[PDB]
Amino acid sequence: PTRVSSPVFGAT
């Protein structure tokens, strides 16, 4: 887990 640019939409 990090996040490099745009928001991410993950595990429900």
Place this chain on the structure above:
Amino acid sequence: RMSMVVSGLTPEEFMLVYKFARKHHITLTNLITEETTHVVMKTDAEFVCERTLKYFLGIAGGKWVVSYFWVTQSIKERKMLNEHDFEVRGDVVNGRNHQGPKRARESQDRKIFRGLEICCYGPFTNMPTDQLEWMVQLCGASVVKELSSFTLGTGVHPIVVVQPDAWTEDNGFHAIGQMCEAPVVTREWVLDSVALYQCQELDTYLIPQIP
């Protein structure tokens, strides 16, 4: 007629895509629009990316959703490779091999939300409502703005979409049945549907409604 955007790339990665776009006379932008024809995802060795807003919207709009590998290889090989060979195949949430991008790329008639009528009963994180609405629209829903503005009558099925844990003083998102005659799904219903480019069934997304 090529415009593209990128997702989940670092600045160094963006630059290659730039250098690449410069070479092949491709327009490159920050924001996805209808004119975008390509979306470049950071993926792993076998074309599985994370789920981003652009991911969604590039599937929704039947666009080329391709691996960043499309880029690094076309560079490595000093020519523009073919998109079909780099088409993202899955994501970390919806499965590695589902091929939403492909499904959607082809099925621009058989459009997953045909004759549905959706309402994004705000608020949402990380996503303006109107993007969610644009998303369902590219997928062939029509957007109702207001719980009462549903167009009941013959044939046309309504859906209220919400994001439960986006609420302040919550459980108000349980009181929606008392305001009309529609199923109430989580946003995950839209996101998974769109990922898979295949209308999911509400069952596992249905929020239960207080009469």
